[PDB]
Amino acid sequence: GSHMEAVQNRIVEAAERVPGVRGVIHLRARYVGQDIWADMIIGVDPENTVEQAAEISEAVQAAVCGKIRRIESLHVSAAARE
Amino acid sequence: GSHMEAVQNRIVEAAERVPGVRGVIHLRARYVGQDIWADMIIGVDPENTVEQAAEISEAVQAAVCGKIRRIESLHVSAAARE
């Protein structure tokens, strides 16, 4: 839906405002009732530690869920991006 | 509607993140089709100039409309608040 594209835009913008995010590589969002469940991959510095990449991913989870209240499940993984 | 309260929450938060805003005193939002038309009053420093208060109001108009894409009309006035 178009309202869905509005939501996906908000998710991408929210994630890209988090320190350490090198773009959103992938985002799949779906409605479960009125709730959004979503899975996303962010880009990170290949020289970040795995621990740092996990910290960024968690920061993205908190930022995105803080800004888009209809999200009730959000998984964030990371991949190296230059 | 409840989705309307979500929109009003987003409007208030967006406005209160603008430098110079001393809360949202009043916000009336209504749907015109799928678009939001809204009228709001912000609080400002009573010692700001009228020109400064107009600048803050314009900054609020741009910030709110930038964050909530469904808004197609937004009027922002200001009043002194301590």
Amino- and carboxy-terminal Cα gap of chain A: 32 Å
Gyration radius of chain A, to the nearest Å? 12 Å
Largest interface: A-B, 4 and 4 residues
Taken from the alpha-carbon principal axes, the silhouette of chain A is elongated
The CATH homologous superfamily of chain A is called: Cation efflux protein, cytoplasmic domain
For the largest beta sheet of chain A, what order do the strands appear in spatially? 1-2-3
Q: Which CATH architecture of chain A would you pick?
A: 2-Layer Sandwich
**Residue share in helix of chain A:** 40-55%
Number of domains of chain A: 1
Please provide a written account of the structure.
The structure is a homodimer of 82-residue chains. The first copy, chain A, has two helices and three strands, in the order H-E-E-H-E. By secondary structure, chain A is α+β, with helices and mostly antiparallel strands. Chain A has a single domain (1-82), classed as Cation efflux protein, cytoplasmic domain (Alpha-Beta Plaits, 2-Layer Sandwich), CATH 3.30.70. In chain A, strands 1-2-3 form a three-stranded mixed sheet, with helices on one face. In chain A, helix 2 (50-67) links the parallel strand 2 and strand 3. In chain A, helix 1 crosses helix 2 (50-67). Chain A is elongated. Chain A binds chain B through residues 6, 9, 69-70, and chain B through 6, 9, 69-70. It is classed as metal transport. The entry lists the keywords Cation diffusion facilitator, magnetotactic bacteria, metal transport. The assembly is dimeric. The entry is titled "MamM CTD H264A-E289A-C267S".
